[PDB]
Design a protein around this ligand. Sequence first.
Ligand SMILES: Cc1c(NC(=O)c2ccc(C(C)(C)C)cc2)cccc1-c1ccnc2nc(-c3ccc(C(=O)N4CCOCC4)cc3)[nH]c12
Length: 271
Amino acid sequence: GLGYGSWEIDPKDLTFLKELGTGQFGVVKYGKWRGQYDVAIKMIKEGSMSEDEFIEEAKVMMNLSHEKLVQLYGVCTKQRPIFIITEYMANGCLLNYLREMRHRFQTQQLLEMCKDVCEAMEYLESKQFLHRDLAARNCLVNDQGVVKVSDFGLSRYVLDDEYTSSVGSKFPVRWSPPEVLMYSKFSSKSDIWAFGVLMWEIYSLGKMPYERFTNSETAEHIAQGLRLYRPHLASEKVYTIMYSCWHEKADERPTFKILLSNILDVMDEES
Ligand SMILES: Cc1c(NC(=O)c2ccc(C(C)(C)C)cc2)cccc1-c1ccnc2nc(-c3ccc(C(=O)N4CCOCC4)cc3)[nH]c12
């Protein structure tokens, strides 16, 4: 309507129904858009986001459409707090989902979660778009058990120093390759490394990577060429795929297109 761009949702079209929790930008609620369509609504806490830079990027992010990406539907900018409207995922974050032992997951289900994530990441890679914080905590699960990648690229707009500094308390040390920890060298290959750690989280049913180490000790371990080792539920072929993501040389790490082909081959082998 009048006074609203293509990236703009009228907050009057929202019905707030339940609190979902709190993320880096504050409270997130479940609601309906125009009384019918399920949405998740991020209420952006004041001082948490580089809002003007995000709004300029929101336009591009809304065009990132893939069935395995948690869709950005629009933004509510003509206010304070600003809202980010996204697809709603009924089963919540993947990390908590993995930790629920009631699911009694089969390894074929765990491989399907890896494939869902890999398809989303191949799509982002095809658009030269980095996630920047790929991990099980940044994946969500829908009512059909499909895993989708969430909040891709939003790390760029976080104003929190503890999250942005590589030695910060909230920085994703355990999902970072040596070149990020040593030189701040971010690339498609740092998303590849993080994907390998995510496959390890899936096959480990949500254990924390390097669980007996601090972040400082993890950075040292990785720098010395040491790695996570095989989760009990991962076959040798699955372990070979996640391990390939951790090559010390970033240029020797696979692309998401190659990882997708490896995962499909293993699904065919372990059918
Ligand atoms: C995504 C999300 C965030 N994170 C963030 O905004 C956020 C922002 C920034 C970042 C960077 C920048 C660091 C990368 C990361 C992250 C925070 C809160 C809710 C949701 C959320 C969105 C979309 N859909 C969602 N669905 C949930 C849900 C929750 C609980 C149950 C629940 O209560 N259950 C009970 C029974 O067991 C499991 C489900 C069911 C469903 N939650 C959702």
